[PDB]
């Protein structure tokens, strides 16, 4: 038995009636624990994700397999049985914090490992690819692909416009469009990092590594009718299947596997090792198990934890760097950056986003400072011993730069189209059927000259593909 | 033709490529456009509204019918023919922006009406009535029927458990669980200010004053079945209606009607004519048409005009005041108070929250000045004739007190049962049956002690009604 | 010894040199660890406190000396011995966090007790009254006093044209033109409540209430050339001088007093005992101790503590309670809004703003959620027994209204000139040659209208104080 | 006349009294005027400046004496007679908004072009050298200047900490502890661009330059006993000179010089031309005279111009560069962050922010958008002819790299002592005298280790400045 209270700690006489002139009569000023609990009401909210803003999330454990020190440096994976608390949060992509889970998007596959050389952020998605190379375009992927800025409804003609005018998009949609556009849920889904990173190892040798999560449950995904039959009951069925699925201690897991390339490949290849429009070989880059991790914890309050998580791709921790993807490049900024602004410059003490690993620096002040901060020394360089001070053994490696220019400039050996039709050849005959049904569904309103654009990058990554979608579209590519 | 640019102004050369080391190689920091332009993308969201996130606006013109200069002084409202430019934001209640416009809710319908004497906000919804008596509960009513704040999945065992320990709710979900629950859109739906608010005439006389506003287009309702049905479809279908009328040229509206009653009723009637738990007889005080409203221009940016639209009950003009409804008064506190933290401190002067009438007054600054503000003189009272003075021609009327003390203390004459009976009794035998049927398809699931709570508060407003209701969820209740 | 850290928990490879192309070359954008130090430094400021921006904060220790439980049931105040924590935060008004400390002003003396029943704000100044008596024009006289909003300096002619108009001013100016207009320091101060509170007993039996704080270290003013002789080598005399004592051990410490009136006095007095620009005679009313604050202890982060500390008359305990001073309950609201803005939602779970009571309520979330919140549970009323309940036992006390009409209205028995007239000939000849001396220096340079109206407001206190300004003022006042 | 009018624009009966429980008694929520009133007053204060928050603006001409096309492609600079509008802030460093305009301290002199191809901000100081080298310093140089985060009180043992410690310090002390260390005023002051930029010619050829304003009414500055003398009276004395020069006609002007260096000529100097803690000699290479600007009308409003001024190394415009001085690097950066924190993400669209030059592009929404943004395409590449495209005319340069890795290391040829005993040298006797007088005050309290370096430092600069400044502080350098 407890006293409800004001935030000042006074015990609350009546929580039903505000205090008013007689039993009837209009409300005074001064209550103060009416004012109180309406303003903090009218303060709850915050602002959602500008892209990922529906989702859902867990906490588990990583397990390393195969020790990965011969290839990188990071502590998390030095050792076979090591374990790694991690968060963990699935999304979609476009829609807003409300929108149902049954809608065709990649899904956010983001991974907070809480390393003891600190915070190691993996923001991945389900498909291992992104339909742009540069983040300077990410903001018109978005705004194309977001609700019509004066209708608030998704318009085809909108992002097809943006895709069909941006063909290095035409390996993404390929995947996305195919059923694993719809996961089943988040449980039943492929994870990657997408990215090209670099692994450096103790003795400052580098490698090119991509990341894979594969599925202890399978892959399952949604035709558009299967979804739809979802959609008519439920608009969070994969938030309810997570949070389920944990509860009842079915918990899911993945495996993490990754390809290593040497960087003097980039030659024998016929398109750049870093474009996140491509992927590598698994028949030359072979899946390599590192070990697995399992979900088996949901959070204590969704806005606390969920909510107020953040990720970021510039989370590197001691041999795992960036690599010269232009895409990875510009999120190594924005992520911070937004978080900032969603979440406060304090955004980093708040708990799930909280190091295991100590934190010490000469960073003060800011809104919301809960901490309880110390000392007169908050400046480096210092005359004092006791005070943290810079540490070579974790300097980051020094990659080579081959430009002798300050460019704007696309990367040489684009290749936009011909993965994609390797992807295509790859699918069965009845993925074939739903790939070309599900593009036909999405282009049959968009504007002519968009549409016959469409089918002609199609056409270029196969004409079989290109074909079949022009059939199906009743559009006669004959003269071309 | 026009040049893309920067915020300073400055053309850019290429809206497509990052600034890197050469062709492939990792990117600069010296890259202005591109940091400019992703760090506005980062910022583009603003929080949601705490309730009524989901929804969509037009703006429109209200005509006068029948002058009321016998009961309000209201300049807008003085005169047969008189136009007055209208916003109006439609809305649900309890789900985030993105959320389906198929849910069981409440429906706002929020006008503004720019007056030669100020903006005028009637806040309405299209029930009548209100589930809750005093603002102080609002928080709690809100947070029960908000998803659950572990799972972010609405629970009914957590709402049905607030209202049935909340009985002067009875009323309210007798209206909610017909089918009027799930409007079909925004366009086929009733309006009501809900709340009695205070009409007073040149002479200084005072009347109560309820609003209705009637659909030209009809009530259409949706059943769970049908509800469900367009939720597969689509996710936002009154938004794409409400957009598609106005685009089409099918302008939708609604006639104004008011209730007037006397002040001295009250003493007369066996419940408080300003608890919004109730309605007012028709037959008693019949409903008197005041003008017509018709919606006819969507907005050119969403963001812009109907997300960052504000309204409040407390925007009132002379000539209408509020009551003593003591759910109004906290309403008079929260509507601005959420504003200044959602949109900021010079709210007001967002295009669409501006009024028509002149604005001259001695506050200043705070963030995003955008006015231009000039002179000395930011204080009253001053020697200068020519700076704005008050003007006791707009004095507001002096409401008599019936209260001896400062009091927490709920209303005399509750009542809480006797409406629900009237409503239940008034249905068809259809609208009987498809209350129950709603009504047992949400408790069905629920804890059985709060189960039984409901039951017998529906058996305490009509004995049929809570018998119905038990034998539909095999609740046997011959023991009470 | 300890590793520079980012906020990730990675340690810190190099603190000198940004991430470059060769050693002079461009910076890249992959320098995680300047942008995140770059980006918190450009985050460290909050806005300042709209007025007192310049202030100096200390804890320490209040102990009762005369248990009050016949007066009040406040607990702080229940036993003789009795010790309750505080926070004090001393202040300037009206320029802004680095002015300088040496300027005419009231002095603010905010002190937060840390009770058992919960924080207890008693937000004093210095002098014992007040400018005004009606919270609707303190954004007024603030905007007067405020540097002007075109030039950022204060002038004369803008406050005393307010001042005059505003004749209630006339008793606090003869006390701010007093050398005691600038106090020696913090600790050779003085601290008044200002207002009427009501105390109410554990029988329900009220009285107005008056505090007064009496400096141990004694009082000690400067004149206008001490203060100028002082601003020329130290713009933050007082903030050193308050760290220095008590840095030394010399804590500067105040006995607390009361001043208490019986309600019905409000017939035998010829001023109304709730108008702030009044003083109650010590000789009808006189000081009772209380007991004796010591502050002893500096703060560990002057920001995290002293700037961010929020202080507010609304927080009242049992047994304390508002009066119905018209100025009070304006600040009962003002200062939690403020703070919200300044601090933000979540601004009560700064730790110097902490109760050591216990708070347990069904507020959630808001910007920078930091305690870890869980539970299903966030509304009242629930099935639970173990959820928080409101407590009948800490009901406020109901004050009669003797009003019978909601009305705006100055009060009764205003007179405004005859306690300031009592002060000036309270005064040593010493100290009334000092008040003409400043009030000639202030007066000397504003408009000749204005000068004349303040000469006839202080003419109407005492003819003798009004005759010396007009002769010192070169005004010829005969003919009136 | 005018009505005092709420911000819906309904007039106000009444601006002095609150509403009440008649005419004495407490108040009553339904206030708006009061509440609207006091919660925009609540609001009014945004964040100071991080630096430089001590201020004053005013507006004027620059006006071309010599065109510069043959160096630079800048619109501005292209033809003889060109009149460009300007808004200047002056200001101090370290201390906050209202501290004395009479401390110690480089001036900041930011200068805003309102040119045709966009907004130019050349953000200056008086001084034309800086403390550091690298913009990873910055954070740690302000910390150990700024107050000391206990105290609040500025303490030379740490900024002289950290000085010492980072000798390249040691140029820009021997400049700022002169007299000119504390300007008389804005108008009697230098200015200078401090970094090395770019200009690069409508042939693409680039070239190193450097900025200086030599102000029409002469350079003068204060003792530290005339500082004093000063600060006894006035702490806003700067502010006023100029607001009142302004206003009396007698416009303060000063001529801009440029010098201009080859790149190659790197390679042959024994410091780096880009490290912004060297001078370029006048001899080697010489002032050349481009035009003149005067400033001639003040603002009308002091925050909404001075305040919320935004200005940025990174606003360049065609033809002006960054170069690579790792300094200036950062402040690209580092101002618009801290510009989006202190005046919200739409800080560009405040009035004195706008540019002259037309503003187009698919950026949206954000707080306060108060632009009436309207149409369907927001992304580019669209299908659309009409909507805002790239313009290759308008590309930056594409500087050589020399670095073949991404390293953190510092440049070559620091030099840290020649040119701070060039400038020592330089001095007459008396500025001499001044300059030991200076440090030795700033000196004698400081940790004798610390003192020491700093005497070491000062004494590799030149052994007479060393000697002089050890014997005035007592300290014996013998045994070094
Ligand atoms: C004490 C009771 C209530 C409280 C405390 C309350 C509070 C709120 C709050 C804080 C908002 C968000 C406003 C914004 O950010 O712009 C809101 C929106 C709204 N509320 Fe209420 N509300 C209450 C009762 C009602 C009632 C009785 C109705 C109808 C009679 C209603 C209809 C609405 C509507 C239509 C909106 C959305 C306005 C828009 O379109 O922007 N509310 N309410
Ligand atoms: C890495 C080094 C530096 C950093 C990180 C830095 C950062 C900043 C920041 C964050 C502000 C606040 C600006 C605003 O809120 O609008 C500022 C203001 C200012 N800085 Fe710097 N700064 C640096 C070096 C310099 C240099 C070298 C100069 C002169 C060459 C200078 C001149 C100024 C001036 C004049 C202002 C005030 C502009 C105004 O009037 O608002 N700063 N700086
Ligand atoms: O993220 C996407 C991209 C394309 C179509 C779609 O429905 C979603
Ligand atoms: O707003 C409401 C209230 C009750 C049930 C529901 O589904 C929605
Ligand atoms: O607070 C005040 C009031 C009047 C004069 C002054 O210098 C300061
Ligand atoms: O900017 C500065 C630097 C050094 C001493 C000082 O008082 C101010
Ligand atoms: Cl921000
Ligand atoms: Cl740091
Ligand atoms: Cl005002
Ligand atoms: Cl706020
Ligand atoms: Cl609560
Ligand atoms: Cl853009
Ligand atoms: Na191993
Ligand atoms: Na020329």
């Given at each position: 038995?407890?006293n409800?209270?004001?935030?000042?700690?006074?015990?609350?006489?009546?929580?039903?009636?505000?205090?008013?002139?007689?039993?009837?009569?209009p409300?005074?000023?001064?209550?103060?624990?009416?004012?109180?609990?309406?303003?903090?009401?009218d303060?709850?909210?915050?602002?959602?994700?500008?892209?990922?803003?529906?989702?859902?999330?867990?906490?588990?454990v990583?397990?390393?397999?195969?020790?990965?020190?011969?290839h990188?440096?990071?502590?998390?994976?030095?050792?076979?049985?090591?374990?790694?608390?991690?968060?963990?949060?699935?999304?979609?992509?476009?829609?807003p914090k409300?929108?149902?889970?049954?809608?065709?998007?990649?899904?956010?596959?983001?991974?907070k490992?809480?390393?003891?050389?600190?915070?190691?952020?993996?923001?991945?998605?389900?498909?291992?690819?992104?339909?742009?190379?540069?983040?300077?375009?990410?903001?018109?992927?978005?705004?194309?692909?977001?609700?019509?800025?004066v209708?608030?409804?998704?318009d085809?003609?909108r992002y097809?416009?943006?895709?069909?005018?941006?063909?290095?998009?035409?390996?993404?949609?390929?995947?996305?469009?195919?059923?694993?556009?719809?996961?089943?849920?988040?449980?039943?889904?492929?994870?990657?990092?997408?990215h090209?990173?670099?692994?450096?190892?103790?003795?400052?040798?580098?490698?090119?590594?991509?990341?894979?999560?594969?599925?202890?449950?399978?892959?399952?995904?949604?035709?558009?009718?299967?979804?739809?039959?979802?959609?008519?009951?439920?608009?969070?069925?994969?938030?309810?299947?997570l949070?389920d699925?944990?509860?009842?201690?079915?918990?899911?897991?993945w495996?993490?596997?990754?390809?290593?390339?040497?960087?003097?490949?980039?030659?024998?290849?016929?398109?750049?090792?870093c474009?996140?429009?491509?992927?590598?070989?698994?028949?030359?880059?072979?899946?390599?198990?590192?070990?697995?991790?399992?979900?088996?914890?949901?959070?204590?309050?969704?806005?606390?934890?969920?909510?107020?998580?953040?990720?970021?791709?510039?989370?590197?921790?001691?041999?795992?760097?960036?690599?010269?993807?232009?895409?990875?490049?510009?999120?190594?900024?924005?992520?911070?950056?937004?978080?900032?602004?969603?979440?406060?410059?304090?955004?980093?003490?708040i708990?799930?986003?909280?190091?295991?690993?100590?934190?010490?620096?000469?960073?003060?002040?800011?809104?919301?400072?809960?901490?309880r901060?110390?000392?007169?020394?908050?400046?480096?360089?210092?005359?004092?011993?006791?005070?943290?001070?810079?540490?070579?053994?974790?300097?980051?490696?020094?990659?080579?730069?081959?430009?002798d220019?300050?460019?704007?400039?696309?990367?040489?050996?684009?290749?936009?189209?011909?993965?994609?039709?390797?992807?295509?050849?790859?699918?069965?005959?009845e993925?074939?059927?739903?790939?070309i049904?599900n593009?036909?569904?999405?282009?049959?309103?968009?504007?002519?000259?968009?549409?016959?654009?469409?089918?002609?990058n199609?056409?270029?990554?196969?004409?079989?593909?290109?074909q079949?979608?022009?059939?199906?579209?009743?559009?006669?590519?004959?003269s071309?």
């Amino acid at each position: 038995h407890k006293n409800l209270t004001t935030n000042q700690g006074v015990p609350v006489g009546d929580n039903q009636n505000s205090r008013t002139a007689g039993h009837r009569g209009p409300s005074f000023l001064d209550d103060y624990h009416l004012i109180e609990k309406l303003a903090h009401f009218d303060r709850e909210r915050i602002p959602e994700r500008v892209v990922h803003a529906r989702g859902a999330g867990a906490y588990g454990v990583f397990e390393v397999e195969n020790s990965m020190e011969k290839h990188t440096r990071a502590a998390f994976l030095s050792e076979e049985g090591k374990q790694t608390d991690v968060f963990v949060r699935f999304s979609t992509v476009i829609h807003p914090k409300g929108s149902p889970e049954t809608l065709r998007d990649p899904r956010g596959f983001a991974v907070k490992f809480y390393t003891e050389e600190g915070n190691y952020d993996l923001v991945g998605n389900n498909l291992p690819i992104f339909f742009i190379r540069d983040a300077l375009k990410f903001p018109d992927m978005v705004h194309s692909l977001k609700p019509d800025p004066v209708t608030n409804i998704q318009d085809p003609d909108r992002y097809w416009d943006f895709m069909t005018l941006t063909p290095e998009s035409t390996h993404m949609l390929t995947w996305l469009f195919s059923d694993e556009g719809i996961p089943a849920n988040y449980a039943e889904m492929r994870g990657s990092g997408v990215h090209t990173f670099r692994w450096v190892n103790k003795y400052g040798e580098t490698k090119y590594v991509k990341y894979h999560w594969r599925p202890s449950e399978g892959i399952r995904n949604l035709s558009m009718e299967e979804a739809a039959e979802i959609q008519a009951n439920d608009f969070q069925h994969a938030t309810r299947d997570l949070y389920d699925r944990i509860e009842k201690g079915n918990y899911p897991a993945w495996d993490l596997y990754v390809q290593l390339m040497p960087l003097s490949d980039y030659d024998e290849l016929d398109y750049d090792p870093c474009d996140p429009t491509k992927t590598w070989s698994e028949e030359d880059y072979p899946l390599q198990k590192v070990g697995r991790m399992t979900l088996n914890r949901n959070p204590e309050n969704f806005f606390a934890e969920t909510e107020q998580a953040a990720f970021t791709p510039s989370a590197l921790v001691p041999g795992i760097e960036a690599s010269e993807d232009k895409l990875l490049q510009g999120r190594l900024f924005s992520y911070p950056d937004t978080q900032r602004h969603r979440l406060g410059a304090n955004y980093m003490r708040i708990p799930v986003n909280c190091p295991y690993a100590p934190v010490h620096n000469n960073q003060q002040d800011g809104f919301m400072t809960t901490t309880r901060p110390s000392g007169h020394i908050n400046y480096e360089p210092n005359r004092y011993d006791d005070q943290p001070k810079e540490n070579p053994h974790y300097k980051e490696s020094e990659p080579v730069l081959h430009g002798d220019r300050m460019v704007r400039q696309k990367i040489e050996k684009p290749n936009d189209f011909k993965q994609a039709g390797e992807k295509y050849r790859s699918y069965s005959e009845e993925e074939k059927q739903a790939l070309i049904k599900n593009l036909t569904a999405d282009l049959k309103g968009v504007n002519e000259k968009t549409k016959l654009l469409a089918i002609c990058n199609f056409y270029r990554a196969d004409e079989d593909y290109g074909q079949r979608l022009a059939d199906s579209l009743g559009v006669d590519i004959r003269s071309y």
